[PDB]
Structures are given as C-alpha cells and as structure tokens.
Design a protein around this motif. Structure first.
Motif, mmCIF file in Angstrom:
data_model
loop_
_atom_site.group_PDB
_atom_site.id
_atom_site.type_symbol
_atom_site.label_atom_id
_atom_site.label_comp_id
_atom_site.label_asym_id
_atom_site.label_seq_id
_atom_site.Cartn_x
_atom_site.Cartn_y
_atom_site.Cartn_z
ATOM 1 N N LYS A 191 -1.823 16.324 -74.202
ATOM 2 C CA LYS A 191 -1.933 16.542 -72.761
ATOM 3 C C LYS A 191 -0.537 16.439 -72.163
ATOM 4 O O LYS A 191 -0.002 15.342 -71.988
ATOM 5 C CB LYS A 191 -2.886 15.527 -72.142
ATOM 6 C CG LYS A 191 -3.026 15.632 -70.635
ATOM 7 C CD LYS A 191 -4.031 14.618 -70.115
ATOM 8 C CE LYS A 191 -4.237 14.761 -68.618
ATOM 9 N NZ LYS A 191 -5.280 13.826 -68.115
ATOM 10 N N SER A 192 0.061 17.585 -71.850
ATOM 11 C CA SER A 192 1.441 17.635 -71.386
ATOM 12 C C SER A 192 1.516 18.571 -70.186
ATOM 13 O O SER A 192 0.495 19.009 -69.648
ATOM 14 C CB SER A 192 2.374 18.071 -72.523
ATOM 15 O OG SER A 192 1.951 19.304 -73.082
ATOM 16 N N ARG A 193 2.744 18.879 -69.763
ATOM 17 C CA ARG A 193 2.956 19.780 -68.637
ATOM 18 C C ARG A 193 2.520 21.206 -68.939
ATOM 19 O O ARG A 193 2.385 22.005 -68.006
ATOM 20 C CB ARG A 193 4.429 19.768 -68.228
ATOM 21 C CG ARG A 193 5.289 20.758 -68.991
ATOM 22 C CD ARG A 193 6.766 20.427 -68.876
ATOM 23 N NE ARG A 193 7.113 19.233 -69.641
ATOM 24 C CZ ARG A 193 8.356 18.800 -69.828
ATOM 25 N NH1 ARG A 193 9.377 19.462 -69.303
ATOM 26 N NH2 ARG A 193 8.577 17.704 -70.540
ATOM 27 N N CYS B 179 -0.269 21.840 -71.268
ATOM 28 C CA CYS B 179 -1.713 21.770 -71.479
ATOM 29 C C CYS B 179 -2.314 21.001 -70.308
ATOM 30 O O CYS B 179 -2.523 19.789 -70.374
ATOM 31 C CB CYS B 179 -2.036 21.112 -72.814
ATOM 32 S SG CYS B 179 -3.798 20.923 -73.140
ATOM 33 N N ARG B 180 -2.593 21.717 -69.225
ATOM 34 C CA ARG B 180 -3.155 21.136 -68.017
ATOM 35 C C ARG B 180 -4.656 21.393 -67.950
ATOM 36 O O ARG B 180 -5.187 22.300 -68.594
ATOM 37 C CB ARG B 180 -2.465 21.705 -66.776
ATOM 38 C CG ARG B 180 -1.006 21.304 -66.647
ATOM 39 C CD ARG B 180 -0.279 22.141 -65.609
ATOM 40 N NE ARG B 180 0.006 23.490 -66.094
ATOM 41 C CZ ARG B 180 -0.724 24.562 -65.806
ATOM 42 N NH1 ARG B 180 -1.791 24.453 -65.026
ATOM 43 N NH2 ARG B 180 -0.384 25.746 -66.296
ATOM 44 N N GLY B 181 -5.338 20.574 -67.155
ATOM 45 C CA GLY B 181 -6.776 20.676 -67.023
ATOM 46 C C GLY B 181 -7.568 19.943 -68.079
ATOM 47 O O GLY B 181 -8.757 20.232 -68.251
#
Ligand SMILES: [Mg+2]
Ligand SMILES: [Mg+2]
Ligand SMILES: [Mg+2]
Ligand SMILES: [Mg+2]
Ligand SMILES: [Mg+2]
Ligand SMILES: [Mg+2]
Ligand SMILES: [Mg+2]
Ligand SMILES: [Mg+2]
Ligand SMILES: [Mg+2]
Ligand SMILES: [Mg+2]
Ligand SMILES: [Mg+2]
Ligand SMILES: [Mg+2]
Ligand SMILES: [Mg+2]
Ligand SMILES: [Mg+2]
Ligand SMILES: [Mg+2]
Ligand SMILES: [Mg+2]
Ligand SMILES: [Mg+2]
Ligand SMILES: [Mg+2]
Ligand SMILES: [Mg+2]
Ligand SMILES: [Mg+2]
Ligand SMILES: [Mg+2]
Ligand SMILES: [Mg+2]
Ligand SMILES: [Mg+2]
Ligand SMILES: [Mg+2]
Ligand SMILES: [Mg+2]
Ligand SMILES: [Mg+2]
Ligand SMILES: [Mg+2]
Ligand SMILES: [Mg+2]
Ligand SMILES: [Mg+2]
Ligand SMILES: [Mg+2]
Ligand SMILES: [Mg+2]
Ligand SMILES: [Mg+2]
Ligand SMILES: [Mg+2]
Ligand SMILES: [Mg+2]
Ligand SMILES: [Mg+2]
Ligand SMILES: [Mg+2]
Ligand SMILES: [Mg+2]
Ligand SMILES: [Mg+2]
Ligand SMILES: [Zn+2]
Lengths: 202, 63, 102, 157
Positions: free
Chosen positions: A17-19, A21-23
RNA sequence: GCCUACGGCCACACCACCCUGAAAGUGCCUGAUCUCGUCUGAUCUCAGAAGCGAUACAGGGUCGGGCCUGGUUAGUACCUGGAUGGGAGACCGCCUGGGAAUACCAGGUGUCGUAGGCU
RNA sequence: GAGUUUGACUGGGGCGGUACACCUGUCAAACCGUAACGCAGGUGUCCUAAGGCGAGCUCAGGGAGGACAGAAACCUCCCGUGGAGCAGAAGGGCAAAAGCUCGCUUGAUCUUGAUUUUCAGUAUGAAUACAGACCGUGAAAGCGGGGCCUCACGAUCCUUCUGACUUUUUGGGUUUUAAGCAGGAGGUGUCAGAAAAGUUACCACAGGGAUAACUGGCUUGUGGCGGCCAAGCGUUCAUAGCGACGUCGCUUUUUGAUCCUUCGAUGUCGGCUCUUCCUAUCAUUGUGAAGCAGAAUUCACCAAGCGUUGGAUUGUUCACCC
RNA sequence: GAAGGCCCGAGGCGGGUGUUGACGCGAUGUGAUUUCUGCCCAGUGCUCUGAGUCAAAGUGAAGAAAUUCAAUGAAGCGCGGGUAAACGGCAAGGUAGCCAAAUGCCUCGUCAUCUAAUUAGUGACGCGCAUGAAUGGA
RNA sequence: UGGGUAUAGGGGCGAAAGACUAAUCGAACCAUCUAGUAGCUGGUUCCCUCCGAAGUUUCCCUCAGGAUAGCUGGCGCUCGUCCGUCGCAGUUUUAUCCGGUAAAGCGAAUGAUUAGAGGUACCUAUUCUCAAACUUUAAAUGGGUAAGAAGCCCGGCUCGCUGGCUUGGAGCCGGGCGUGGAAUGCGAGCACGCCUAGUGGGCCACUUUUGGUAAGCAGAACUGGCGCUGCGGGAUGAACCGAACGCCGGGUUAAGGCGCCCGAUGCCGACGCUCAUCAGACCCCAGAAAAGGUGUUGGUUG
C-alpha cells in the motif's frame, strides 16, 4: 470474497500500500499483541512459535481468525493475564481482483485484500507464558493451524521469552549487568560506550 | 485479429549464422573528426618535411 | 515571451556586432502573378472542381515568432530573420520584470 | 513500449556514489590523455556536459582526438552482427585510464629487459605467461598430531 | 619536533566535550587618512602593532558518536550448469562450480607532495 | 442530379480509450536492448531572463529570545549535508554551487564540417566536441554560440520574408515583372506529412475460423455441491440436528474468461415423441442415529431395480398455483 | 389571373395539364360520421418588408505599360416581421383527453372481475422508462 | 376481358409492395470498352545432385500487404595452403574496468508498521513486520578492453599548432632487437565483394518473468526445439527422452526396457515395505487436497 485458494501462492511481486497502490481497504487484523503485553521479561520465560513450512500468502482474514482461536484457548486455560500472544506477520501485500465479467481488455484489477507473505521457516504467531503452560501453548498453536492454509509446525524456542538470547545464557547476562529489562524485552549492554552509562548501571 | 508485437528469439542465431565480424584493423586509421587546428599544422609538418631531407642524410652518416 | 526592441547582434554586411532594431515579421499579401499562383489559377479554371488539397486538420495552436532584425546604421540597413520558439503570447515593447513586488 | 529518451533507465547508472557527491576532484582534470591510449568510460552525473550515452557506460576504447577538456574515443559497439567503431566525444570527467593497458606496457618493458639481461649473461629466461599448472608433488607433514576427525552434525530445529 | 602559503587523496581527516601548547608563524587584536564597501569599518577593503594563547589553530584525552579495517554472521542466504531427483502442489534436496549482506566483536583514527620558516 | 470519401490500433466488432509523435520511474530478470488496451505520471508549454558572465550571500526547519505580536508578521543569536530551491512530470545532479541577491549584458548572434541518440545506422527532432568570425562578462584564469541534464516538435509542392550575385527573363539593350541560388517562416498531432459524413434487414462481391454469435475442448472467478477447525445455537449439553471467524476440495446441469476446431454452412429456442445413462436417493427394499414413547419427521448408510403424474397462465426453459 | 402555377425537354415561336381559367389546375398533410384539435416562431424551413457584406462589367487615380489602388457597389446572405392542420418541441414547460394499450423499462405493476388453479382477457388506478391532440386526441 | 394504341432503363409505370417493366428489377436486356481491376481464394506439369530459410528491426491511411535490415543461394575474386608467420573465435586463462538483480538492510536515509520501557501528546533508548516504481551494502551469471614487430630501443628531421625554455604534441627518417612475447581450436580477406530468391501469421519447452482466480489464456527475456525432420523410446501424440538420415553386412550402445501380447532376467538376483469390499504400477502426462486411522512398519522426546 474469493476463497483463499486464489491468492495462496506468491505469484506476483510484493504489491504494498503505497502512493501508487491507492484505494486499498483496511486489513482484517489490526491488533497483533494480546494478553498481558506490559509484563516483565521474567514473567513469561517460555515461548512457543508457529513456524511455517510453505512459501505462501497468509490472508489477513486468516491472521485474525487464528489470533482469536489462539487467544480464546490461552484465556480459558491460562487466564486472561497469563500469556502474551504476538502475531509476527503484518499483511502488507495487497491482492487485486478483476471486474465482475470486454473480458481481458484492461484486466489490471483493483485492490481486494491484504496478505502476509510467509517464508519456509518463518514465525507466524508467538506465545510466551509460564513454563508450566508449555502444553497449553502447543494446543493453542495447534488449534490455530486449522485457521491457516498449508503446513505449519509448532516449535518451542530456546530463547528466553520474546528476546533473542538463549535461556541458558539469559540468567548469566542479567547478573553481569549486560541485560536490563525494558518492559517486554531486554536491552543488550555492550562494553563499547561512554563510561558514564556504566557507572549509572552499577 | 491480434498478432505478436516484439520478438528477439531467433535473432541471436541469425547474427551468429555468419559470425559477429569486427572491422579489420588497418594501420593508419582515418583522421576524421580530429581538431581542425591540429590537422592544419600536421599538414604543414608533412608539406615541409622534405625541407630537412639533407640534414637527415648527414645525421644518418654519423651512425 | 518578451523581447526588447533593440538588439546588438552580428551584422552580416557590416561583419561585426551592430545595434539592431527588432520588429516582428508579417507574411504580406500574396502576389497574384507568382508561378505557383499562375498555374493554380489555370488549373482551377474550367470544369473538374477543386484540384489541389485543402488542408483541414489543423493542430498547431501557435506559430514560430519571426523577428525582423535590422541594423540601425544608415549605410547598411540590412535585415535578417531570427526565429524563436513557439509561444502563445508574444510582446515586443513590454517592460522589464521586477523581482520584489506585490 | 519504452521511451527512447537519452537518459531513460539511468537512475542508478549516472548517479553519484554514497557520500561521494559534491565538486569533482581536481586530479580527474589533471590526467593526460594522448592519442592512442586505452581509456575507460563511466558517466558522471555531477557534470552533464559531454556525457557519454548509457550504452558506452563501462565500455572501453582508444583515444583518437584530443580537444580542450574533452577527447574522442573509438569504442566498439555490437549492434546485431556488426561490431561498430563509434567515434564519440566525451569530456575528461567521464574517462579513466585503463589499468589493463598500463599493466601490459609494464610487461613489455620487463620482457624487453629480461631478454636483454639474459643475452648479456647467455641464459634463457621465459616470457610467455602460463596458466595455473597442476600442483607438483609434495610431502605433507602431520606434525605428530593426527588429523582432526570431522563428522556431520545432527539436525537442530 | 613544530608553523605557514599552495595543494593531491577527500571523515582513519568529521562531530561533541575536556586538557595542554617553545619559538616563529597564523589568528585574534588596534584604527578609518587614503583605496574600497556597508543601515552600521561587524563583514569587506585599507592603515597599523599597544595587548594575549581567551578563542581560532595544533597536539592529547573520551570503556565517546560516526568513519575506516578486519573478524563474525557463513560456506549461511543467493547462484552457473545438470538429472526420466523427491513432492498433488507450494517448493525442497543432491551433483558441478561460484559465493553475500546487518546485528554482534576487535583494531585503527589522517596522510602525502612543493616552497619558505621556527627549535 | 453526378462523382467520391466516411483513419488505424483493438483479447470479434462498435462504444470508450490513444497504449498513433514524445518524456520520467518501474516492469526489465545488476552492460545496452526487451512486449501487453502492464503499472504510476507528464507533453503540444514557459522564460529579455527563468539566457550569459562575475561578485557577494545561504536554504527547509528547529531552539532560545525581543513593545503591540498571538499556533503563523518583523528583529537577533545558535544549530542546521541540504531534510530548501532550481518554470513544469519524474529521476539524476547541485552549498563560499546549478540555489538566493545584485550589476554589466545579449554565445538565444554569423559560419564549415565531424560526432552522439532513436536508426536501416535514412530523415527529422534533440544533443556532443572542435574550428573560423564577431561579441558579452570577469582583475584574470576562464566561461557562454539558450534554459543543470533527460520531453516540449514537422518532408516534397506552394506562398511569404531576408541575403547574395559576371544568376536567367530565350535576336541584342534599358527599366518593370517573372524565374533561380541561399537562409527563415506559414503544416500536415493519423505528428516520415491523402483533400473526406452517414445509412443499408433491399443489400452485393472477394475472402476470413487470422474473427464474433450456436456445440465441443482448457479454465472454475461466479454458480452448484461437499469436507476440516470448533466460537456459538440447541433451556443446561461444542459435534441429535446445526457451524460464525477461517480453511481445503469437488462438479461441469449457471455464467464468465479464452478463441483451439468449423464462415466453398455441423440447421439454431422450446415443446412433443422416444430410448438409454449418471446419483449429489424424493418414494419404495434392507439398516444405523436422534433433542427416535407411539404417530409423524429429521440425519446417515448399502443402493439407480422401480416410479416420479394430471392441469390453469406463459413461446418460454425457469417460475407460480390447482 | 396565362408575360401564370406545375412539369417535361439536348435544342426552337418546343411540349404536357390545356378542347383548361380559381366551383380551375398543380403540390402536400390528415383520413367517414360524431367530438374536440391546447401551448411554444427560440432552432430549422417558408414567406414578407427597406438600411453590414457584396462578382464581372463600368467609372476614377497612380504608373512607360503590364499592374495596382480607390469609389461605386445586383441578387443572395446578414438584420427585422409573420408563419406550427411548416418540420418539430411541450422559445413553451403537456391543456382537453387516454393508458400498464399494437405504446409501461422496472413488471408476472396494484385492485376487482374472469377459473379448482390465469405471466393471458376485461374494467379500473396513472410523476405515463418513453401517452396525447390533422407528427391528429377521444 | 380480348384487340388496337401510349409511355423505354437512372427511364417507364406504380390505390405505393422498391412493386412491376418478357421465369431477369433497391435500376431490365444485348453487344462492346474487357483478357476491367483484385494487398483476396484456387491451381501452377520431368528426374537427380548440392546448399538452405523466415514469421524479427525501421518506415508505410500499414495490422490478410509492401519498402528496408537480417537470415539464403549463386557468382566469384584477393591471398594463405610442411614447420613458421599473418589472420580468425557464440571458448577458457591472466590483467583491468562496468552494473545495483538475487540475497540483505531499514538499532542506516525515504515510505510503511507492532508492542512496551525511560525521561518530561512528544522525546530518548529498544522491539515486531515490509517495499516494484526505497536503500547504506551486494553477488552468481553477464558486458567492455588488453594479452607486441602496426612493437621495443637508440639517434635525427619537419610544423604555420603548443611556448619561460625541443617546451610540448603529432608526423617523418636512419639504425639495432624475435624467446611472435597466455591456453586451445582453426585457412582468411575483399564496407564479410557482386547480384540475389523466399520470408516478414509462427509455435513449444527448462529457467526468468507481466496481466489474469485460472486457462491447451494473453504478453516478454534467454537458450534449445517444432515449423523444414524421418529414426529408437513415452501404448497413442508436431514440441518430451535418446539420437538426427546416401545404399548394405558384422559388431556395440543410447534413452527405454526384459510375465505374455512384444525382441530381452526360463538370475535358484539382494534387502526391506505393502492387502487395498474404489490396491498400486515411474519425465512431459493426461484426477487429487485439507484433515484423519488402536491397519502395519520405522524413528524421536519423555
Ligand atoms: Mg507479425
Ligand atoms: Mg501495439
Ligand atoms: Mg468557370
Ligand atoms: Mg514508460
Ligand atoms: Mg568509537
Ligand atoms: Mg563486517
Ligand atoms: Mg460509391
Ligand atoms: Mg479496424
Ligand atoms: Mg538492463
Ligand atoms: Mg567560437
Ligand atoms: Mg480460430
Ligand atoms: Mg465456488
Ligand atoms: Mg464458512
Ligand atoms: Mg450415494
Ligand atoms: Mg398441457
Ligand atoms: Mg399537416
Ligand atoms: Mg421562424
Ligand atoms: Mg395528462
Ligand atoms: Mg385460457
Ligand atoms: Mg385493461
Ligand atoms: Mg396542434
Ligand atoms: Mg388490352
Ligand atoms: Mg444507356
Ligand atoms: Mg421497404
Ligand atoms: Mg541433400
Ligand atoms: Mg524463424
Ligand atoms: Mg491466407
Ligand atoms: Mg529479401
Ligand atoms: Mg522484403
Ligand atoms: Mg502473411
Ligand atoms: Mg504464451
Ligand atoms: Mg492466441
Ligand atoms: Mg508454414
Ligand atoms: Mg533447421
Ligand atoms: Mg503415456
Ligand atoms: Mg546394424
Ligand atoms: Mg515394453
Ligand atoms: Mg473425521
Ligand atoms: Zn549593418
């Protein structure tokens, strides 16, 4: 959701979960330490781990269910404050799911859940308690194996609690002022610092 | 009616079919891209190189 | 884009740097008796319709600004086209920018 | 498909090493590069002018042209089946002298000295390098003490 | 032994703190007529030599941080090539060779060149 | 009324998107290269300085302070490897710099050739290193022929402008005009660059299983079905009957995905008719279990021998009701 | 209203309607009767007016001339008015009516009736996906 | 309703169906232009010998097609052709560079993240778990160059470039010096000459790897293979294993086999394991899991 048979193998690269891979939805497991966490190191000398044997992905749903299954047995058999369960697998790998199927045109899916990539020989769940509760940890960790896929084996570590020092040397290092307890763990004290800290200990 | 996009599968075989050939090393390589000011003086060194041909014969006789 | 009305650039006829008066280049009306215009009119005469393509799919939103330089020397008075990059707004008079203001 | 940018994929290639940032040391500019010497190519991100392309990074060639703080190198570039002698122009911050060439020129100076020193003495010395030969026969003393007995250890967790 | 000016390598050189420092040197220090520059002679430029080692600077100290080197981790992880090897699979062993990196432990802590100068 | 046109890519096509000309990070598996309608973004600009040079200066932020003045105004000191800024996306680079500020400027000028990158090693675009002029700047060494680097752009024909000259304007001469040489610009974004709206079930031809709709095949997300673990339900009692949180399978009677077979054609929905098969057994035969007293019912086992109907509505399978 | 409307025609003092003349001929829409036929002229189209654009020819001016420039400047466009039993919509916000309709996606709408049982039928209900008044309503 | 007349092909006629206009109508029929064109199907005729592919690059109103590069063949030609020396290499060795992947790290930067402790919500020292668009570190494999006569050494000459000064630099001249200055294999050169066909639908496997639940799915890297290829073996089958092919004899093997079909154990093979009222029987490969058993046999810790 889909069965764990679809996201069991580590087939893709780690997708955190990074900038980019959002949501991503929130993981199912949010509490990793249960029991009496604020206990001294001398409180719970014995420790037992749930070592894995597969290179797979353990879902956050299975991490939470196995956490409850192990906690509900240590509370019933060792009391509510006679153990400290520490789940040592944080779900960071995000799973993707394709739309409810024009079929594969733009197939890159949206986040579905989170899994924890475990390795062959990596600890999944650790429980520390009294020495006489050895058989209770084996059974508590055995009941939580059914909440996990693959194969896991229960191992009683030679370390002293959640520390990284063997139980045979732990007593000696405490007397030599080389280990001092700070809450759940101990601090290693080398002879390679300012001498003022040495005077404060003695 | 899609097709394949990019491939370098059989290209290594085609390249080595006749062997990867390096250019034959020639003495007195080409002087292309050298400093024009340097090339001017080097042309003058060869243009007037015969001016000392008499001194060369005299010095060779001393050996 | 703002350029001054006076440049000190190389004058080709003078062979040295000279003060130049900078203006902007305009196309100018097309001569009705150019060779490509004379044959275009003769080709369009009669029946047959349109004989040359008519460009429709315009994509450029700007144009290359062409600066008509001119040496201020009364003897030379030589011009030279100096083109700059594309820009939406271009001013020749303008005014110098100030750093600390509101 | 990828982009054909000049510095595409050079994130770590042209980057400076850890704690090696800042101004370029002066001895890099003080090295003499004559025509015909073998020099290495390694792009330096501190100086963007005269920067070699990403394909010539780590390549090696000989110098044919020398200008002010810049030299020309004849580098071999295999495209498909034709190795091409590329005449590139890079500044001196991106080049270093090939120590392999200097080590060979020292072997010639010694070979010419050995064969000259051997002629004055009449002896015959060898100059050709030979690969690692099989080890000759030799005795191994136990020193009175017996060899240490080893055995596989049992499995632990 | 030590100090300048210019340096090469650019932390073994840095950082914090403490101790000590001949002689010269350096710096601090003393002034604003001229040169020059600022809101202000603090900085900068200029002029100077009453004062001292306070600081800068240099040396030393710290079970110092960092840095450097080595050990350890470790023939561990990883890996070239190979098999009609195992296993439902996930993956793992062996053969052929190659071979790491933290934690942890130990040691070290500027050096070299040019020129001039002081004991 | 006539002639013609109505882009391409595309998990069929259309719609959508531009993956059509470009750039950054990644994918990419440590040279380079490397695909998908892979991932996260950017581009058709902006700048007389945000170009060039010199000089001085040091940032983000924090601590302690100082009338109004406060969590944020300004002044001061200290710490501060850049955690700021450098026009923009990203990456790289950068500290008496490439940032900030100031004063002089127009190397963003006039030229020849070579070289790099995409490359066929063609062009364009964008770069590199020289050389010959003419200049800028600094005391000078030097630095500068645009932007710190990686993107920010355009052939022939035609028009227009500038420049040059023993250049042509055709039997000579003069002046207009026209043509030519050389260098810019006007643009083709489908971005190596036709001049371009549909509709067709009234349709036609060439073909295509390179390509859709119907079966089969792989797959089982979905659908259906069945285990395992035991929180809990079952008044009490986890497992008579159930099974949350989890998890492992199976099936090909759903649908989807795929496009392998068939487009010189495999007739395509349902019903009717008719035979055989499967069991994941509703009933009947023989049993086990109960939260089985009897009766009724539920669970499970051997088990497909036998049977599973008549009608209203709907083309409907599917439902619903008698 | 015939020097015409409409149409044929390569062409004429061509030809059809027309051996005709508005109770006629030609061009359309709607579709007996009964009963009504609502709103919108903005858009598109038609039509009617007199104050920017405007070809060739003609006039003027400059020039050795080619040429150039200027003034003048038809119809049409633009501007303005009318027109919807014109296309249409409901610039106007669907009026009278009608309906789950040959028109209702949800839907096998709800209710009553019709049958032992009705996704059908009929009568009703109507914010009607997406009814509606000579694109004629009843 | 007969007959006689009128209207003829982009025309006629139509109470309107694109109806009808000689079995022909959403544009009749006939002849010609016309052997219209087709990047699209089909076919393309004797034998033998020798060599032998490509489905990839760039561009194209291209994506069923061309142009171009590659791969192919032909024609040669310049030399070499005992050692020796040139020259050559899908290979090692030596020397020296290049990289940021695996792994590792985050008590180091960026980002994410768990639990206590200490000092006073922070702050310090620890602790749990991670990165593909993070990294101080950092391989294996891999890439580039070099391993001499086109050299070394001694003595001079030229220059208009360079300049405190033969000071550089480069070029040239004379003389001297093979132990050819790593191993191994091998004939090379002519922009790998000149002309040049076919191809530009590929597909499959180990490993690596992207999207996808997955796919006999889609898309890449590398090498081999299939296509273009038969042969032995896997019953069988484009790709797997072995091995590639003129026509034969003898022998020996590979992979795989040896109860019978079916060539070979018709060995007095060795040691154990296993009873299955769905036994089991070997690459690719053609049905199994989690979880169980006081079936049986081992082992481990008490
Ligand atoms: Mg293709
Ligand atoms: Mg494509
Ligand atoms: Mg005309
Ligand atoms: Mg990209
Ligand atoms: Mg230390
Ligand atoms: Mg170490
Ligand atoms: Mg047509
Ligand atoms: Mg298409
Ligand atoms: Mg790479
Ligand atoms: Mg110049
Ligand atoms: Mg097909
Ligand atoms: Mg399911
Ligand atoms: Mg469940
Ligand atoms: Mg059954
Ligand atoms: Mg019936
Ligand atoms: Mg009407
Ligand atoms: Mg109107
Ligand atoms: Mg109404
Ligand atoms: Mg009925
Ligand atoms: Mg009704
Ligand atoms: Mg009306
Ligand atoms: Mg008749
Ligand atoms: Mg005709
Ligand atoms: Mg019709
Ligand atoms: Mg043959
Ligand atoms: Mg091929
Ligand atoms: Mg075909
Ligand atoms: Mg060809
Ligand atoms: Mg071709
Ligand atoms: Mg083809
Ligand atoms: Mg594939
Ligand atoms: Mg396919
Ligand atoms: Mg074929
Ligand atoms: Mg072949
Ligand atoms: Mg088989
Ligand atoms: Mg034989
Ligand atoms: Mg057999
Ligand atoms: Mg059971
Ligand atoms: Zn002039």
């Amino acid at each position: 959701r889909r069965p764990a048979r679809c996201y069991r193998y580590c087939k893709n690269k780690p997708y955190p979960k990074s900038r980019f891979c959002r949501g991503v939805p929130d993981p199912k497991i949010r509490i990793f330490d249960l029991g009496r966490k604020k206990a001294k190191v001398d409180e719970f000398p014995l420790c037992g781990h749930m070592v894995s044997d597969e290179y797979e992905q353990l879902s956050s749903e299975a991490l939470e269910a196995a956490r409850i299954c192990a906690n509900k047995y240590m509370v019933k058999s060792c009391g509510k404050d006679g153990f400290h369960i520490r789940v040592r697998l944080h779900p960071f790998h995000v799973n993707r799911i394709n739309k409810m199927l024009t079929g594969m045109r733009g197939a890159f899916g949206k986040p579905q859940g989170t899994v924890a990539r475990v390795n062959i020989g990596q600890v999944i769940m650790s429980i520390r308690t009294k020495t006489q509760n050895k058989e209770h940890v084996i059974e508590a960790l055995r009941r939580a194996k059914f909440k996990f896929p693959g194969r896991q084996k229960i191992h009683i570590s030679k370390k002293f609690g959640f520390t990284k020092f063997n139980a045979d040397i732990f007593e000696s290092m405490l007397a030599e002022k080389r280990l001092i307890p700070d809450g759940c763990g101990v601090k290693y004290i080398p002879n390679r610092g300012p001498l003022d800290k040495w005077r404060a200990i003695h | 009616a899609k097709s394949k996009n990019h491939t370098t599968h059989n290209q290594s075989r085609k390249w080595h079919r006749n062997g990867i050939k390096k250019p034959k090393s020639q003495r007195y390589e080409s002087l292309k891209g050298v400093d024009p000011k340097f090339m001017r003086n080097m042309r003058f060194a060869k243009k007037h190189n015969k001016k000392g041909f008499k001194k060369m014969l005299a010095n060779n006789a001393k050996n | 884009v703002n350029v001054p009305k006076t440049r000190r650039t190389y004058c080709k006829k003078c062979g040295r740097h000279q003060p130049h008066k900078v203006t902007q280049y305009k196309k100018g009306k097309d001569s009705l008796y150019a060779q490509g215009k004379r044959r275009y009119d003769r080709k369009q005469s009669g029946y047959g319709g349109q004989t040359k393509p008519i460009f429709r799919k315009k994509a450029k939103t700007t144009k290359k600004i062409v600066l008509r330089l001119e040496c201020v020397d009364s003897n030379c008075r030589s011009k030279r086209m100096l083109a700059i990059k594309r820009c939406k707004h271009f001013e020749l008079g303008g005014d110098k920018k100030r750093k600390g203001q509101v | 498909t990828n982009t054909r940018g000049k510095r595409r994929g050079t994130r770590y290639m042209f980057s400076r090493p850890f704690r090696k940032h800042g101004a370029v040391p002066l001895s890099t500019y003080m090295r003499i590069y004559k025509k015909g010497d073998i020099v290495d190519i390694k792009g330096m991100g501190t100086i963007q002018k005269g920067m070699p392309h990403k394909c010539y990074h780590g390549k090696t060639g000989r110098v044919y042209n020398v200008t002010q703080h810049a030299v020309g190198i004849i580098v071999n570039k295999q495209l498909r089946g034709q190795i091409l002698a590329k005449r590139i122009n890079v500044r001196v911050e991106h080049i270093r002298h090939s120590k392999s060439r200097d080590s060979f020129l020292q072997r010639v100076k010694e070979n010419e000295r050995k064969k000259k020193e051997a002629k004055e003495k009449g002896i015959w010395v060898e100059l050709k390098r030979q690969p690692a030969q099989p080890r000759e026969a030799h005795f191994v003393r136990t020193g009175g003490v017996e060899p240490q007995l080893l055995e596989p250890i049992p499995y632990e967790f």
